Design an enzyme around this catalytic site. Structure first.
Site, PDB file in Angstrom:
ATOM      1  N   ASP A   1      34.412  36.488  37.889  1.00 17.65           N
ATOM      2  CA  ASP A   1      35.121  35.284  38.344  1.00 17.65           C
ATOM      3  C   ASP A   1      34.459  34.007  37.836  1.00 17.65           C
ATOM      4  OD1 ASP A   1      35.712  37.466  40.116  1.00 17.65           O
ATOM      5  OD2 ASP A   1      36.276  36.104  41.720  1.00 17.65           O
TER       6      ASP A   1
ATOM      7  N   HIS B   1      36.374  30.740  38.727  1.00 18.32           N
ATOM      8  CA  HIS B   1      36.877  29.832  39.763  1.00 18.32           C
ATOM      9  C   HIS B   1      36.664  28.336  39.477  1.00 18.32           C
ATOM     10  CE1 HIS B   1      38.707  32.594  42.499  1.00 18.32           C
ATOM     11  NE2 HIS B   1      37.626  33.353  42.549  1.00 18.32           N
TER      12      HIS B   1
ATOM     13  N   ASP C   1      40.497  35.497  37.741  1.00 17.49           N
ATOM     14  CA  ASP C   1      40.078  34.466  38.687  1.00 17.49           C
ATOM     15  C   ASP C   1      39.391  33.273  38.001  1.00 17.49           C
ATOM     16  OD1 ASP C   1      41.287  35.937  40.699  1.00 17.49           O
ATOM     17  OD2 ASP C   1      39.506  35.960  41.988  1.00 17.49           O
TER      18      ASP C   1
ATOM     19  N   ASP D   1      41.302  28.022  40.989  1.00 11.27           N
ATOM     20  CA  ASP D   1      41.142  27.894  42.439  1.00 11.27           C
ATOM     21  C   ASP D   1      39.694  27.669  42.830  1.00 11.27           C
ATOM     22  OD1 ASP D   1      43.815  28.067  43.145  1.00 11.27           O
ATOM     23  OD2 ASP D   1      43.768  30.231  43.536  1.00 11.27           O
ATOM     24  N   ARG D   2      39.503  26.943  43.934  1.00  9.48           N
ATOM     25  CA  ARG D   2      38.195  26.740  44.601  1.00  9.48           C
ATOM     26  C   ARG D   2      37.324  25.674  43.936  1.00  9.48           C
ATOM     27  NH1 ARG D   2      37.676  32.279  47.391  1.00  9.48           N
ATOM     28  NH2 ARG D   2      39.842  32.383  48.136  1.00  9.48           N
TER      29      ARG D   2
ATOM     30  N   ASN E   1      43.545  38.104  41.040  1.00  7.01           N
ATOM     31  CA  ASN E   1      44.445  37.833  42.154  1.00  7.01           C
ATOM     32  C   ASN E   1      44.795  36.347  42.313  1.00  7.01           C
ATOM     33  OD1 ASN E   1      41.577  37.849  43.210  1.00  7.01           O
ATOM     34  ND2 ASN E   1      42.570  37.472  45.198  1.00  7.01           N
ATOM     35  N   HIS E   2      43.924  35.466  41.823  1.00  9.64           N
ATOM     36  CA  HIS E   2      44.204  34.020  41.833  1.00  9.64           C
ATOM     37  C   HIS E   2      45.117  33.533  40.689  1.00  9.64           C
ATOM     38  CE1 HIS E   2      41.720  32.475  45.229  1.00  9.64           C
ATOM     39  NE2 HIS E   2      41.199  33.682  45.096  1.00  9.64           N
TER      40      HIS E   2
ATOM     41  N   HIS F   1      40.362  43.453  37.733  1.00  8.76           N
ATOM     42  CA  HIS F   1      39.781  42.445  38.604  1.00  8.76           C
ATOM     43  C   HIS F   1      39.296  43.008  39.948  1.00  8.76           C
ATOM     44  CE1 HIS F   1      38.838  38.585  40.246  1.00  8.76           C
ATOM     45  NE2 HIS F   1      39.576  38.858  41.303  1.00  8.76           N
TER      46      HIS F   1
ATOM     47  N   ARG G   1      40.579  41.652  53.937  1.00  8.67           N
ATOM     48  CA  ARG G   1      41.328  40.553  53.327  1.00  8.67           C
ATOM     49  C   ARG G   1      42.772  40.463  53.824  1.00  8.67           C
ATOM     50  NH1 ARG G   1      38.793  38.991  48.261  1.00  8.67           N
ATOM     51  NH2 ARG G   1      37.276  40.562  47.551  1.00  8.67           N
TER      52      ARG G   1
ATOM     53  N   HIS H   1      35.735  40.113  41.595  1.00 14.00           N
ATOM     54  CA  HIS H   1      36.518  39.920  42.831  1.00 14.00           C
ATOM     55  C   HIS H   1      35.660  39.764  44.115  1.00 14.00           C
ATOM     56  CE1 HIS H   1      40.136  40.143  45.362  1.00 14.00           C
ATOM     57  NE2 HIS H   1      39.857  41.358  45.803  1.00 14.00           N
TER      58      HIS H   1
HETATM   59 MN   LIG Z   1      37.725  35.410  43.065  1.00 14.18          MN
HETATM   60 MN   LIG Z   2      39.559  37.830  43.168  1.00 15.98          MN
END
Ligand SMILES: [Mn+2]
Ligand SMILES: [Mn+2]
Lengths: 294, 160
Positions: A58, A60, A86, A89-90, A118-119, A167, A215, A242
């Site tokens: 990741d 991010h 990923d 995001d964040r 997943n993002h 991922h 989750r 992940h």
């Molecule tokens: Mn992530």
């Molecule tokens: Mn993830």
């Protein structure tokens, strides 16, 4: 397309205090999205890759950490790369992050690879920051253009018929790689099922078989599930991302699975290192760590 | 006058493993692990306080309904009497409060600019006004946007 100019401007901040933005034009970013999308669609959804290769987890939107990863790992095309998803995001710089990654995909399409996390899904990156960054810095139309692009990302890779990369992790429904290959793109990520699991599932040392995931999405899987999967498919290792891991990498089920995470001090709320895994031509695997200075 | 600095430290590598399967093709290096230096937290603030999943999801539920609507642009000449419409905020569901509303046309003033144009009607959704999104906003924000419009005002409208 203006690709080398775009890359030049993205890399111009290499020596700047971290956080400085690179603001490409809307037309530029749109061109990166449309061109990379064509390339993703032209290559298999299940990538078949050969060593040597450097594998990263990741990011991010921690753009300055990505720059250091390339500094130390070697900027493309010095090293071949596979990212496990990923990208967004964040972090505060999802845009610079994804634009640099897409630019390298376009420039070196046979030596640079990006999987879907997943993002990289509208219903998730709407919520966790990417839509906000797009709306603030550009417009919503540009966010929808990114979605169209992300909807075409490949889902998994197999390195030298021996390392299975995705991922999240395994699916209780995954019995044949053809189940991955028959997935048509563009596609959204469903709330359940094979594609969901590949992007969402997690290993758990405390579960026997398949369990529920904290989750609220997908499943957890135990060490025996991993062993059975590898034996069945004549594979040696699962490489996934992940989950934040303190050292940037963490083995599971002896060394049958590895988690890679490449965003150090993740969103300033963890004290972790990032890592990448190198696979050489003899299939020797080694780790390089990115650790924030004190 | 920032001067980034780079460096590398070595730490103990991966341990030798006990009896690895002879049929395994991959193997793991026992050589020292390279630990490279990236930015400190002081040099690189990785925090992001602007992420608000609760507000985002509230906006998103509202957005999902609007793309079921057919959208059409409207242009109105704003005269001395204004735009000739009044608005009402409605939530995405029951008893949602005041924060993230759809902005609906409650009234079209007889003889007003909206009325004589003919297109905008009661219960139309105001999606965008002078380039500003009104999807998932407060009614007071909407009212401010509409008050500040001048001349030939550009709308995007949605209809059930
Ligand atoms: Mn992530
Ligand atoms: Mn993830």
């Amino acid at each position: 397309l203006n690709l080398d100019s775009i890359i030049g401007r993205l890399l111009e901040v290499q020596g700047s205090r971290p956080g400085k933005n690179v603001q490409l034009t809307e037309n530029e970013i749109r061109g990166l999205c449309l061109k990379s999308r064509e390339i993703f669609l032209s290559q298999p959804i299940l990538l078949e890759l050969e060593a040597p290769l450097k594998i990263c987890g990741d990011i991010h939107g921690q753009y300055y950490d990505l720059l250091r990863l390339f500094e130390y790992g070697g900027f493309p095309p010095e090293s071949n790369y596979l990212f496990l998803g990923d990208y967004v995001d964040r972090g505060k710089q999802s845009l610079e992050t994804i634009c640099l990654l897409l630019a390298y995909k376009i420039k070196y399409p046979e030596n640079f690879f990006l999987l879907r996390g997943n993002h990289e899904c509208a219903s998730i990156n709407r919520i966790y920051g990417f839509y906000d960054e797009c709306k603030r810095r550009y417009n919503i139309k540009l966010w929808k253009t990114f979605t169209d692009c992300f909807n075409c990302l490949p889902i998994a890779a197999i390195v030298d018929e021996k390392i299975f990369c995705c991922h999240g992790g395994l699916s209780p429904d995954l019995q044949s790689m053809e189940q991955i290959r028959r997935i048509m793109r563009p596609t959204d990520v469903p709330d359940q099922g094979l594609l969901c699991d590949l992007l969402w599932s997690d290993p758990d040392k405390d579960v026997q078989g398949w369990g529920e995931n904290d989750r609220g999405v997908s499943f957890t899987f135990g060490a025996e599930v991993v062993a059975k999967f590898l034996h069945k498919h004549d594979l040696d290792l699962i490489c996934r991302a992940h989950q934040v891991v303190e050292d940037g990498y963490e083995f599971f089920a002896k060394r049958q699975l590895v988690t890679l995470f490449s965003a150090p001090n993740y969103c300033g709320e963890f004290d972790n290192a990032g890592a990448m895994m190198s696979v050489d031509e003899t299939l020797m695997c080694s780790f390089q760590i990115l650790k924030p200075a004190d | 006058p920032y001067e980034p600095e780079s460096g590398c430290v070595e730490i103990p590598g991966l341990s030798e493993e006990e009896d690895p399967a002879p049929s395994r093709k991959i193997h793991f290096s026992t050589a020292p692990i390279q630990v490279f230096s990236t930015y400190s937290n002081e040099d690189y603030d990785r925090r992001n306080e602007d992420v608000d999943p609760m507000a985002a999801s509230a906006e998103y539920e509202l957005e999902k309904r609007v793309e079921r609507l057919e959208l059409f642009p409207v242009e109105l000449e704003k005269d001395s009497e204004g735009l000739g419409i009044s608005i009402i905020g409605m939530g995405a569901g029951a008893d949602m409060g005041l924060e993230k509303l759809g902005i609906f046309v409650k009234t079209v003033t007889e003889g007003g600019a909206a009325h004589r144009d003919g297109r905008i009607q009661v219960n139309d959704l105001l999606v965008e006004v002078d380039g500003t999104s009104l999807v998932g906003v407060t009614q007071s924000f909407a009212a401010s946007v509409l008050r500040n419009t001048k001349g030939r005002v550009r709308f995007m409208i949605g209809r059930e």
